[PDB]
C-alpha cells in the first residue's frame, strides 16, 4: 500500500507528507486540491499518442530550411533488420501517406522518438533537425508501445488591522534592533509600521500592538504580512512572510511562532510563505493576530497620446503617479489595448476594497483580452512578482492554455520558475503546468527535472514544488515512474563518484587516474542499471559505460567527462553519448541562460534567420551539482592558442580549421558556420551582458561551430570578437572582407530581430535575475537589458550603436584576453 508513497518521496527528494515546517494546511490542501485536474487530463488524454509523444510543431518551415530541400522530395530510409531500403516523399506527406509502400508504426533509429499522427513530416521536429544539421532521416518499422504500460496506479470589520509583535528569539547571536511589519501586495508595500529599537540580545520581547492604517475589509487576497528584522543606518538581517488571508479566503488569526530566513534586491526567495525548517540555527519572530472572510471611452486628443505613450513603454519603465492615475481613470480605454494590461493593473490601488471591486468588473468585461493573439511576453509580465491577484494572474494563464506543446517547452523552465511568484501553493499556473505536463511525456519529463532541480536546492520553495511534482508523478504513468526511478538512481550513483573523486586531489596525478576508473567499473557491476534515459535528451537511452574514455579535469572543480554506449542497437551510429558531471557551481543559472538562448533561436526562426547557436543540454540535478551534454568534436579557443604557444597569434584558428577540414568544400562551410555562430553569440551575449569572456570558456566544433560555455561566471569589451576570429573572416586591424560584412550583416539583423521582441526578452531577463541569480537582482542589474537593447531608439540608430560595439572589439584585439592571466 504505502510503499508507493515512499517510492514517490525517493523520486522527489522531499517528504510531502511531513508537517514539521507548516503552520496551516495549505500544502496538504493543495495536495487534495490538485487531484481533480490530475484526474481530468489523465482521463481525457489519448493513451496511444501519449505513448508516442510525437514532437511536432505547427510553425512554418523557415526560408533557410526550405532552400535545403530536393524540390518537394525528401528521403526516409526505412530499416527492416539487417537491410534498409529508402523511400521518396514530399514534405506534406503524413506518416500514414508514407507508411503505405506496397498494425505497424514508424520510429527513429536509436531514439525513443516516433513519426506518427495527423501532421505532415515537415511538422515533426526530428525531420526539421535532420534537415538543419544536414542529415538524412532513418526510421524503423516497429510495433506501437503498449498503453497498458502507461496506466496510472489508480485509486468586513471596519477595524484597522493590528498585529501584536511579542518578540524575537534566536538560539545564538552588536547594536540595537527593530521589527518592521509591512502589509504587502506584489512587491508593493501598502502600509508599514516599525517597533522602537531594543538592545539586540538572544531574545527580545516587545509586547507591542503595531496598529496599521489599512482596514480589514480593505485587505486583498494575496496580501502578505512581511515581518523583517533590522539592526543599526540599519541593515536587514532576517525576513519572513505570512499570508494575511488564507487559502480558504479566511483572515489569519492567532499565535504564530515563525522561523525566519537570513541574508548574505528583488530576489524571488524574499516573497515566500515558506518558513525556515532549520529551527535550531534560525531566528524566529513571535506574533498574535486577533480579528470573517471577504466576498467574491471618449477622451481628449492630448491625453490619449499621453496614455498611448505610456502603454507603449517597456515593462521596466516606471509609472509615475500621474501615469498610474491616468491609466486608472481611463480604465476602459486602456482595457481596449492588451499591451496596457501590466501597466493598468500596476495602477490599481490594491489596499482599497471598492477599487479592487471595480478592478474585477473590469476583468469581467475582457472581451478584447480574451480574443487577442497570444503574446508570451505580455502573458509572462502578468505572472511576475509585480502581480499578486489571482484573477489578474489567471487571465495570463488563460492565454497560455492556447500554446501548442512545442512552445510550452520553450518556456517551461521559466513558467516553472514563475510559480515562485504565486502567493498561494494552489494556482492556475501550477495546475496548467501539471496538466500540460501530464498530457505530454516530453513536457512531463523536463517538468520532473525542473521541479526536482529547485526542490533539491531551494528551501524557500521546495515544499510547494514538492507538492506540484507529486501531483505530476501520481499521473505520469508507471512506465515513466520506472523511467524516473532509473534516472534518479544513476545520477545519485555518479554524483557520489563525482564528490568522492574531488576529495583526493590538490592535476590528475597517476593513481587518481585509476581510482576513478576503479569505481566506474566497480559501480558498473551489479548496481548501475543496464540502460537509462538522458535527462537533457529524453530520446537517447544510454546503457554501457565507456570506461576507457571517462576522465576528470585539471581545473579545480574536478568534473567527470563520462561516455556511454547507446543501449538501443538499432542506432546506426557508434558515437558514444557524452555527459559531464560537475559540482561546485550552480547550474540553475546555466539552465536559464541556455533556455534563453533557445528562445532567441526560435525568435530568429520567426524571421527566417538561423544563427546556429549551440545551446547544449544541461540539467541541475541537486545542490551545487548537475550534468552537461558533451558536444562531439569540440575544443576550446584556448587550446588552439596553447598548442602553438605565452600570449596569442592571429593565424592559429583558421589553421586549426583547415587542418580539421578534409575537403575544401566542407571547409568553407565551417568559415561560414563560424561567421553565423560568432554572430549569434556576439549578439546573444551582448544582450544578456555576458559577452566579456576568457577564451577557454568559448568553444568551436571541428565543423566550424563556435559556442560559449560555463555561464556560472580592469576595463571591458562588449563581447569576444578577438583577432583570431577576425582572422578567419579575412580581415586585420583596420580592413574588411567578403565575409566580415556578412557577419556585420547577420549581427545587425540578429540584434534588430531580438529588438522586435524587446518586451519579451526584457521580462525573461528580469525573471531570470530574480528567480535564479540571488547575487544580482538590483534595479540597476536588471536595467542593463534596456540599454543593451537600446529601448526607445529607432532601428537605424540601434545598428550604429551595435556596430560601434563591434568596433570597440576591433580597437582592443587582445587587451582584455591577456589581462585575465595574472
Ligand atoms: C572545456 C572542458 C575541457 C576541454 C576540452 C577541450 C579543450 C579544452 N578543455 N575538458 C574537460 C574535461 C573534463 F573531464 C571535464 C570538463 C572539461 C571541460 N569543461 C569544464 C566546464 C565544466 C566545469 O566548469 C568549467 C567549465 C565545461 N563546461 C562545458 C563544457 N562543454 C564542452 C563540450 O560540450 C559540452 C559543454 C566543457 C567543460
UniProtKB/Swiss-Prot annotation:
Binding site for ATP: 578-587, 613-621, 707-713
SMART domains linked to this entry: PI3K_C2, PI3K_rbd, PI3Ka, PI3Kc
Gene3D superfamilies assigned to the protein according to its UniProt record, in alphabetical order: 3.10.20.770, C2 domain (2.60.40.150), Phosphatidylinositol 3-/4-kinase, catalytic domain (1.10.1070.11), Phosphatidylinositol 3-kinase Catalytic Subunit, Chain A, domain 4 (3.30.1010.10), Phosphatidylinositol 3-kinase, accessory domain (PIK) (1.25.40.70)
PROSITE patterns named among the record's database cross-references: C2_PI3K, PI3_4_KINASE_1, PI3_4_KINASE_2, PI3_4_KINASE_3, PI3K_ABD, PI3K_RBD, PIK_HELICAL
Annotated PI3K-RBD domain residues: 71-143
Residues recorded as bearing Phosphothreonine in the entry: 758
Chain intervals for the UniProt region annotation (Catalytic loop): 689-697
PIK helical domain sequence ranges: 297-475
InterPro entries: ARM-type_fold (IPR016024), C2_domain_sf (IPR035892), Kinase-like_dom_sf (IPR011009), PI3/4_kinase_cat_dom (IPR000403), PI3/4_kinase_cat_sf (IPR036940), PI3/4_kinase_CS (IPR018936), PI3K-type_C2_dom (IPR002420), PI3K_ABD (IPR003113)
Keyword Membrane appears in the UniProt entry: yes
PI3K/PI4K catalytic domain: residues covered: 546-814
Residues covered by the C2 PI3K-type domain: 157-290
Role noted for this protein: Phosphoinositide-3-kinase (PI3K) that phosphorylates PtdIns(4,5)P2 (Phosphatidylinositol 4,5-bisphosphate) to generate phosphatidylinositol 3,4,5-trisphosphate (PIP3). PIP3 plays a key role by recruiting PH domain-containing proteins to the membrane, including AKT1 and PDPK1, activating signaling cascades involved in cell growth, survival, proliferation, motility and morphology. Links G-protein coupled receptor activation to PIP3 production. Involved in immune, inflammatory and allergic responses. Modulates leukocyte chemotaxis to inflammatory sites and in response to chemoattractant agents.
Disease connection: Immunodeficiency 97 with autoinflammation: An autosomal recessive disorder with variable features. Affected individuals have childhood-onset antibody defects, cytopenias, and T lymphocytic pneumonitis and colitis. Some patients may have features of hemophagocytic lymphohistiocytosis.
Protein name: Phosphatidylinositol 4,5-bisphosphate 3-kinase catalytic subunit gamma isoform
Originating organism: Homo sapiens (Human)
Protein's gene: PIK3CG
Amino acid at each position: 500500500s504505502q510503499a508507493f508513497q515512499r517510492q514517490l518521496t525517493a523520486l522527489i527528494g522531499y517528504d510531502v507528507t511531513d508537517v514539521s515546517n507548516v503552520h496551516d494546511d495549505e500544502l496538504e490542501f493543495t495536495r487534495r486540491g490538485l487531484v481533480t485536474p490530475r484526474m481530468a487530463e489523465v482521463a481525457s488524454r489519448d493513451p496511444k499518442l501519449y505513448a508516442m509523444h510525437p514532437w511536432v510543431t505547427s510553425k512554418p518551415l523557415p526560408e533557410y530550411l526550405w532552400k535545403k530541400i530536393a524540390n518537394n522530395c525528401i528521403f526516409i530510409v526505412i530499416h527492416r533488420s539487417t537491410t534498409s531500403q529508402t523511400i521518396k516523399v514530399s514534405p506534406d506527406d503524413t506518416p500514414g501517406a508514407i507508411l503505405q509502400s506496397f498494425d505497424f508504426v514508424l520510429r527513429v533509429c536509436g531514439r525513443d522518438e516516433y513519426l506518427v499522427g495527423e501532421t505532415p513530416i515537415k511538422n515533426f521536429q526530428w525531420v526539421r533537425h535532420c534537415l538543419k544539421n544536414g542529415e538524412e532521416i532513418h526510421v524503423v518499422l516497429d510495433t506501437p508501445p503498449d498503453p497498458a504500460l502507461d496506466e496510472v496506479r489508480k485509486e468586513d470589520c471596519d477595524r484597522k488591522f493590528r498585529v501584536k509583535i511579542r518578540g524575537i528569539d534566536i538560539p545564538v547571536l552588536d547594536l540595537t534592533v527593530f521589527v518592521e511589519a509591512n502589509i504587502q501586495h506584489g512587491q508593493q508595500v501598502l502600509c508599514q509600521r516599525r517597533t522602537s529599537p531594543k538592545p539586540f540580545t538572544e531574545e527580545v520581547l516587545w509586547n507591542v500592538w503595531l496598529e496599521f492604517s489599512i482596514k480589514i475589509k480593505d485587505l486583498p487576497k494575496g496580501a502578505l504580512l512581511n515581518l523583517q528584522i533590522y539592526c543599526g543606518k540599519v541593515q536587514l538581517l532576517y525576513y519572513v512572510n505570512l499570508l494575511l488571508i488564507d487559502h480558504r479566503f479566511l483572515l489569519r488569526r492567532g499565535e504564530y511562532v515563525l522561523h525566519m530566513w537570513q541574508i548574505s534586491s528583488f530576489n524571488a526567495d524574499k516573497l515566500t510563505s515558506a518558513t525556515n525548517p532549520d529551527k535550531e540555527n534560525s531566528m524566529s519572530i513571535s506574533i498574535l493576530l486577533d480579528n470573517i472572510a471577504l466576498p467574491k471611452a471618449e477622451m481628449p486628443n492630448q491625453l490619449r497620446k499621453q496614455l498611448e505613450a505610456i502603454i507603449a513603454t517597456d515593462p521596466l519603465n516606471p509609472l509615475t503617479a500621474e501615469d498610474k492615475e491616468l491609466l486608472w481613470h481611463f480604465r476602459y480605454e486602456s482595457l481596449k489595448h492588451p499591451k496596457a494590461y501590466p501597466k493598468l493593473f500596476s495602477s490599481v490601488k490594491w489596499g482599497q476594497q471598492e477599487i479592487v471591486a471595480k478592478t474585477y468588473q473590469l476583468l469581467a468585461r475582457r472581451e478584447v483580452w480574451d480574443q487577442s493573439a497570444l503574446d508570451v511576453g505580455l502573458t509572462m509580465q502578468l505572472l511576475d512578482c509585480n502581480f499578486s491577484d489571482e484573477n489578474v494572474r489567471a487571465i495570463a494563464v488563460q492565454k497560455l492554455e492556447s500554446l501548442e506543446d512545442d512552445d510550452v517547452l520553450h518556456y517551461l523552465l521559466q513558467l516553472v520558475q514563475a510559480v515562485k511568484f504565486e502567493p498561494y501553493h494552489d494556482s492556475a499556473l501550477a495546475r496548467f503546468l501539471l496538466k500540460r505536463g501530464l498530457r505530454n511525456k516530453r513536457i512531463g519529463h523536463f517538468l520532473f527535472w525542473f521541479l526536482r532541480s529547485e526542490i533539491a536546492q531551494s528551501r524557500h520553495y521546495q515544499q510547494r514544488f514538492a507538492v506540484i511534482l507529486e501531483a505530476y508523478l501520481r499521473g505520469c504513468g508507471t512506465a515513466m515512474l520506472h523511467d524516473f526511478t532509473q534516472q534518479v538512481q544513476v545520477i545519485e550513483m555518479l554524483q557520489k563518484v563525482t564528490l568522492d573523486i574531488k576529495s583526493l586531489s590538490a592535476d590528475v596525478s597517476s593513481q587518481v587516474i585509476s581510482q576513478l576508473k576503479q569505481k566506474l567499473e566497480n559501480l558498473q557491476n551489479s548496481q548501475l542499471p543496464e540502460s537509462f534515459r538522458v535527462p537533457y535528451d529524453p530520446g537517447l537511452k544510454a546503457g554501457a559505460l565507456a570506461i576507457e574514455k571517462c576522465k576528470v579535469m585539471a581545473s579545480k572543480k574536478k568534473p567527470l567527462w563520462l561516455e556511454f554506449k547507446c543501449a538501443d542497437p538499432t542506432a546506426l551510429s557508434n558515437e558514444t553519448i557524452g555527459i559531464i558531471f560537475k559540482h561546485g557551481d550552480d547550474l540553475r543559472q546555466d539552465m536559464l541562460i541556455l533556455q534563453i538562448l533557445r528562445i532567441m533561436e526560435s525568435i530568429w526562426e520567426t524571421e527566417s534567420l538561423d544563427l546556429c547557436l549551440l545551446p547544449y543540454g544541461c540539467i541541475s540535478t541537486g545542490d551545487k551539482i548537475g550534468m552537461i551534454e558533451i558536444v562531439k568534436d569540440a575544443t576550446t579557443i584556448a587550446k588552439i592558442q596553447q598548442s602553438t604557444v605565452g600570449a596569442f597569434k592571429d593565424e592559429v584558428l583558421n589553421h586549426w580549421l583547415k587542418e580539421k577540414s578534409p575537403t575544401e568544400e566542407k571547409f568553407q562551410a565551417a568559415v561560414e558556420r563560424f561567421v553565423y555562430s560568432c554572430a549569434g553569440y556576439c549578439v546573444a551575449t551582448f544582450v544578456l551582458g555576458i559577452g566579456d569572456r576568457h577564451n577557454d570558456n568559448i568553444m568551436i566544433t571541428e565543423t566550424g561551430n563556435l559556442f560559449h560555455i560555463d555561464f556560472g561566471h580592469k576595463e571591458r569589451v562588449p563581447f569576444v570578437l578577438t583577432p583570431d576570429f577576425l582572422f578567419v573572416m579575412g580581415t586585420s586591424g583596420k580592413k574588411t572582407s567578403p565575409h566580415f560584412q556578412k557577419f556585420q550583416d547577420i549581427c545587425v539583423k540578429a540584434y534588430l530581430a531580438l529588438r522586435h521582441h524587446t518586451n519579451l526578452l526584457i521580462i525573461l531577463f528580469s525573471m531570470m535575475l530574480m528567480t535564479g541569480m540571488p547575487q544580482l537582482t538590483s534595479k540597476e542589474d536588471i536595467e542593463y537589458i534596456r540599454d543593451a537593447l537600446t529601448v526607445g531608439k529607432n532601428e537605424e540608430d540601434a545598428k550604429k550603436y551595435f556596430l560601434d560595439q563591434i568596433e570597440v572589439c576591433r580597437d582592443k584585439g587582445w587587451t582584455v584576453q591577456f589581462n585575465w592571466f595574472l
